[PDB]
Structure formats: C-alpha cells, structure tokens
A and B are shown apart, each in its own frame.
With several copies, the nearest count.
Chain A
Amino acid sequence: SCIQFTRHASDVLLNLNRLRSRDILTDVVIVVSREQFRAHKTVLMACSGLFYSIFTDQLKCNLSVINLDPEINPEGFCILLDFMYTSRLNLREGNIMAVMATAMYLQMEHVVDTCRKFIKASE
C-alpha cells in the first residue's frame, strides 16, 4: 500500500553528482593511464559489474586506489563515470569504440547494448 515519488531516484542521483563535483565523501581514486578520477565506491558498484566485484572483495573493499587495465582509455572512462552519476551518455562517432570497450571491461550491459546498436546503424 506504499505511495511512490516519481522523481526521487533522479533527485538522489543529482545530489550524488553534486557531492562528486564538490569532492564530498569520495572514498576512492580510479587510476586510468596516469589520469585520476575520484568517486564514491557505492555509486561505482551500483553502475558496474566490475566495481561491484572489486569492492565486495574482502581485501579490495579497503583499497583507496584502484588501477585499471593499461588498455583502458581515460576519455572513455570519464564519459562512463559521467553517465554513472547523471544517466547521460556522451556518445560520439570519435569515442564510441573507446566507450564500448570501456563499458565491456566495466560490465555496464546497457551502455554496451546502445554502443552495439549505434555501431550496427553506421555499417
């Protein structure tokens, strides 16, 4: 018999992004080919199968620094980190290959799906 507030999840995500922009309560640095990205472990886990697996590990859950595979492109990661905190994906002809490869590595199934569809349309 609950009532539901339609905009609540969006408002929560908007506030989490405000915290990220002001570097409030960020608890991890993600290192991508020497570029560094500060974030909230819980948000990373909520968006990515890879971060979910990492931060549920009894040893890795306590790390303040995570280094990604050197093949990962920092711009592709930045675009995906922005998507995690906003639901908005900056998908462009020049970045789609790097974004899809990063989303496959991060295990972000819905992003991989839209990249596959956008690539298929251009062939």
Chain B
Amino acid sequence: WVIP
C-alpha cells in the first residue's frame, strides 16, 4: 500500500 502507498500514498498515491
């Protein structure tokens, strides 16, 4: 999971 990432900060888009």
Q: For A114, what are the chain B residues with a Cβ–Cβ distance below 8 Å?
A: 1
A interface residue count range (under 10 / 10 to 19 / 20 to 34 / 35 or more)? under 10
**Do most interface residues of chain A lie in helix, strand or loop, or is the interface mixed?**
mixed
- Look across to chain A and name the residue whose beta carbon is closest to the beta carbon of B3: A3
| A18 in contact (CB, < 8 A) | no
B interface residue count range (under 10 / 10 to 19 / 20 to 34 / 35 or more)? under 10
Q: How far is the CA of A4 from the CA of B2 in the complex (A)?
A: 5
Give chain B nearest CB distance to A119 CB in angstroms: 14
- Look across to chain B and name the residue whose beta carbon is closest to the beta carbon of A3: B1
* CB within 8 Å of B: which A1-26 residues: 2-6
Q: Which residues of A contact B (CB under 8 A)?
A: 2-6, 88-89, 110, 114
